Design a protein around this ligand. Structure first.
Ligand SMILES: Nc1ncnc2c1ncn2[C@@H]1O[C@H](COP(=O)(O)OS(=O)(=O)O)[C@@H](O)[C@H]1O
Ligand SMILES: Nc1ncnc2c1ncn2[C@@H]1O[C@H](COP(=O)(O)OS(=O)(=O)O)[C@@H](O)[C@H]1O
Ligand SMILES: Nc1ncnc2c1ncn2[C@@H]1O[C@H](COP(=O)(O)OS(=O)(=O)O)[C@@H](O)[C@H]1O
Ligand SMILES: Nc1ncnc2c1ncn2[C@@H]1O[C@H](COP(=O)(O)OS(=O)(=O)O)[C@@H](O)[C@H]1O
Lengths: 572, 572, 96
């Protein structure tokens, strides 16, 4: 191990252990504030010493010296603002003011975690934070969070610990700075290189780590983030399973896997200084920083937020103040002819190098294509495939919208039979009327009530899509707002296709065998779509059909052809 | 081919083809009755001649001579009642009476299929039908349908054809008596043995068929039922897929697969006579009847509805009147030492016989265990496993019930994380409050409203279970009625587990940090479970736990152990 | 709407793609209509070819293609034979 940053490990949970009962009791009495997931990651690392010397959510004095000088008021280096935000309504409703004692509660199990004592309650310049800490790009994940999720005020204050967060996943692999230190001891280690990561580890990474181990004569701590990462990365359960598949590739007893409940910001260079501090608090003697450490890639105009290696420079600016040795690496690649990996600054400008990008990997994962062993070990690839299956087995939703009696309900049942013939997956059919009877029996037909209904279809459709089913829904869905809502939700889990059954109102009305359009026409049914209520025509549907000009059979054939072109009907 | 039963093939669709336009027009005007799925099977076979001489739903004259003499008023043999039932309310509302002309409509695509001209409208003695046609056992499928689904009155009458049903599955393998006949012709066939079936075909069945073909010097017609079959058999898409996998096992051009839209009743002996008639109408010169033909096995008290071979006797009783040659077979088995199959009565008492029962098969499918090639071909077994996966990949539902704030919500989230760690499937979490917000935002807390809510959970749970998900739901679910409803729905698709979080009301109330039990106590919240509304305690739950005596972590561990003992956590 | 595909050889991947492309573009069903009468002097016998076409069918989405044999005696007349083929397919009912 190594000494904590600042000299004292701020293990608030060990400090306040003797007062637990009392603190608990006192916590039942104060006004409680319930934490967001990101504040819960921060609170966990504060309470266990991970953010030493910090020992509570930053007050303005501390905050400002970081927002601009990468230091805490006490002078210690610290590059990342760690604050507890709240809205004016909560500040008032709870009567929060300096010197107040609030309880911080776990939204997951309602437990009282800590008691914070307010120093101040300031309103920060979200623009200067945006710009001074996370570069300035509005597309940057941290900045987007800063504006859309972070409330208006920051409540600074020291923390006293009531309970350690509960976690039900991987408890034996989670460690507090104190526990990890005791472990390095139990193992008899003295020099430990820590490896940060928010992705599955491939061949190249196994090499960085063994290289660092060999060069610094150190043991390896694979220390992945399991809290919050970049917006769309592979879930942590898949990643942990992947890190575990990799362990057997190191010589017996050389590496140890320990999980870090950090909530990354993707602050590139700053986040890198921050990471070094954290690993030092956890007891690592060395820490790897490679290409694009903690970087979130590039923005929409294709410009990338930080340059490669900038984070290595930043962590370098404080070589003398960060009490942990950084081990640098340049992009590592594969040399086919020699069958080896090395940093680019070691390949003779004439030698052949291979590399599979993020995009190429997703392409192969999606298509079922082979992924080279020089790239990633077999057991790892297997795990990745189990989580990101090919289109051949992914679920999807076919969303149908059109006037009542436009043929959308017959098209839906035929598509269902057709896909059951096709065979790949379980097919769930949600006909407008079925949804109305089974899920929305009590809603009405007001714009708000219809919107609610379509949201209900989307909630169900998303869970079925996530389980790999083929969901077929055919409600009227008059408003573009509900439809886009539907599409956004399902898209979180898989493909969503909007098929607009644009059969003309006259046709629909003239063939209604249930005299519903009739009753509407004689005012027995108020606000009926097409007669009273509107029908916002879909602007950019994936497919437009007409039961006036095409038959159920060929409309079905057209939908099938779309699923086919995108690989959903391939063989599993 | 062979001549229709009664001499004239009742191809109503071919008959009325010239009057299509007119009949169509007239159909738009009469009061329409919408057909159930079973009536649609019956209607399809009536209109195409499959039930020749019959040519409409049976009127009481025809009906009664069958209810008891296995003959139609015209004398011809016919052992199965084919009627169109309706309730008093429909008979009135539509003003149905003798001489009336009703339109019969397809509930699938709303199309107008036929026009029936009412002869009579009688109220049948469901107990005499039950007893004279389907033996008398109340557990018999047909009987259970007779009492729970069949309405109170039967409406007799001849039929005129407007449209042929539409089908989107396997249209090229579906055939009308007329098409089949033209096909036997095209192929140059003259003797045709037809094979009835509602199950995947194994080795034994390939042997019956080739034996009958060799003996009667005939070609083979594999003629499976694709309409309605016994309550829990393998769906017809999986079966057709399995029949198609089998074809290559016959010598080139010896067998033809054709599907029959029949709605079986599982009437053993009578159904057998009926099948002979149907196959005759379709043009088959011979028809196989083996052990337990059309039988639904045995009742609950273990007594089996019909005896083996009884159906062979009954079809024999009319050898002279059924114009098609029956080919009998005794149970066929496998002789290991010789590696051959033959009927039992041709097996010496000396010899050993291998056989895999229905139960042994489901046991192996459920466990992933190997299924011998002497029993069924590899491609067939493959298809069967795709449809009936091992417990290792089946979905399931964990249903939690207990008082508000009994810990069921925290248990639920922990179980979710736990199963995500575990890994096999997609996990959907439906917490009481989430369900209320996402699916029942408008319901209240009236016995009816809660019951509605639990049904809504069950609807969504069933669809997810069917797609192989692990569904975790934790609503209060105060009434046993709602719970049993939930259990019955999910069970249709997979396993359901009821976990009663029996945490005592006092404990729940005393730990409520949201002051909800408080507001209930000072009447601000009417009918709150435990304070006003009741909580019917679960009588036979799969697991009972108490957040007062056990912790979330071990409650979760107890659930996990249950899933494990039943094979759900095995490896896929 | 039926796109017909003429052929006197086994169908490989490339051909499976033409056909699905035409089907998608002309919003049509596929009629794999191979010659089984007389073909170029040394091509693969028709029994082997039919066997091959049959092995290919499962590669199209269920119910999208139909295999029908044509008893034609090709001449290998390039351009003229092409006009001829269009006529023949039209007589057989293909729309494309
Ligand atoms: N091919 C590579 N060559 C060198 N360093 C790399 C390479 N890939 C990743 N790294 C470095 O190894 C760690 C792996 O990072 P990632 O999990 O991809 O994302 S990060 O946000 O944690 O940096 C970081 O230190 C990163 O800079
Ligand atoms: N005011 C109404 N407008 C449209 N359909 C209605 C209305 N009142 C009842 N219905 C019936 O309810 C179904 C329409 O329901 P949905 O498709 O669920 O509509 S949506 O607006 O929410 O998309 C059809 O059976 C329709 O006949
Ligand atoms: N082992 C067997 N030996 C001989 N005939 C059999 C055997 N199993 C089933 N059969 C017969 O073959 C047909 C197929 O049987 P099933 O599809 O299981 O059930 S049935 O209800 O349609 O008859 C029927 O004639 C049946 O009695
Ligand atoms: N009368 C009530 N009884 C119980 N819970 C209620 C009542 N009114 C509101 N609630 C709230 O709604 C949830 C209980 O809802 P459910 O579990 O969905 O009830 S259930 O009986 O229909 O299963 C808890 O958040 C509870 O505080």
């Amino acid at each position: 191990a190594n000494a904590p940053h600042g000299g004292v490990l701020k293990d608030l949970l060990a400090r306040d252990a003797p007062r637990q009962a009392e603190l608990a009791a006192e916590a039942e009495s104060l006004p409680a504030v319930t934490l967001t997931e990101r504040q819960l990651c921060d609170l966990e690392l504060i309470m266990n010493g991970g953010f030493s010397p910090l020992e509570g959510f930053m007050n303005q004095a501390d905050y400002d010296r970081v927002c601009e000088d990468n230091r805490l008021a006490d002078g210690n280096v610290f590059s990342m603002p760690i604050t507890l935000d709240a809205s004016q309504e909560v500040i008032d409703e709870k009567k929060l003011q300096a010197g107040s004692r609030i309880t911080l509660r776990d939204f997951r199990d309602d437990r009282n975690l800590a008691i914070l004592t307010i120093d101040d309650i300031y309103r920060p310049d979200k623009t200067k934070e945006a710009k001074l800490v996370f570069g300035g790009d509005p597309e940057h994940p941290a900045i987007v969070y800063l504006n859309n999720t972070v409330k208006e005020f920051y409540i600074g204050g020291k923390i006293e610990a009531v309970n350690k967060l509960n976690h039900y996943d991987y408890v034996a692999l989670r460690y507090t700075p104190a526990e990890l230190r005791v472990h390095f001891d139990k193992l008899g280690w003295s020099r430990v290189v820590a490896f940060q990561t928010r992705n599955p580890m491939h061949r190249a990474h196994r090499e960085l780590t063994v290289r660092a181990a060999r060069s610094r004569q150190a043991n390896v701590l694979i220390h992945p983030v399991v809290g919050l990462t970049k917006p769309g990365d592979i879930d942590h359960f898949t990643r942990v399973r992947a890190y575990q598949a990799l362990l057997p590739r190191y010589p017996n007893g050389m590496a140890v896997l320990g999980l870090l409940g950090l909530a990354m910001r993707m602050g590139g260079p700053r986040e890198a200084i921050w990471h070094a501090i954290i690993r030092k608090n956890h007891g690592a003697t060395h820490f790897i920083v490679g290409r694009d450490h903690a970087g979130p890639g590039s923005n929409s105009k294709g410009e990338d937020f930080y340059g490669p290696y900038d984070a290595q420079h930043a962590v370098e600016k404080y070589k003398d103040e960060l009490g942990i040795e950084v081990v640098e690496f340049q992009m590592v690649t594969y040399l086919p002819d020699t069958d080896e990996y090395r940093p680019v600054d070691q390949v003779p400008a004439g030698v052949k190098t291979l590399n599979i990008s993020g995009t190429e990997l997703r392409r192969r994962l999606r298509s079922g294509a082979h992924i080279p062993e020089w790239f990633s070990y077999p057991e790892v690839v297997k795990i990745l495939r189990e989580s990101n299956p090919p289109r051949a087995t992914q679920g999807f939703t076919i969303f149908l919208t059109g006037y009542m009696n436009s043929g959308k309900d017959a098209i839906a049942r035929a598509l269902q039979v057709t896909l059951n013939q096709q065979g790949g997956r379980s097919v769930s059919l949600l006909l407008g009327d079925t949804v109305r009877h089974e899920l929305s029996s009590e809603l009405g037909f007001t714009r708000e009530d219809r919107h609610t209904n379509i949201q209900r279809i989307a909630f169900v459709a998303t869970e079925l899509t996530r389980a790999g089913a083929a969901v077929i829904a055919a409600p009227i869905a008059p408003y573009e707002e509900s439809r886009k809502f539907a599409r956004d939700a399902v898209s979180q889990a898989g493909s969503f296709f909007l098929v607009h059954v644009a059969t003309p109102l006259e046709h629909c009305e003239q063939s209604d065998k249930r005299g519903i359009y009739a009753a509407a026409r004689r005012g027995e049914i108020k606000g009926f779509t097409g007669v009273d209520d509107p029908y916002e025509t879909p602007e950019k549907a994936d497919l437009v059909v007409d039961f006036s000009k095409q038959s159920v059979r060929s409309i079905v054939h057209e939908i099938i052809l779309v699923l086919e072109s995108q690989g959903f009907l391939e063989r599993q």
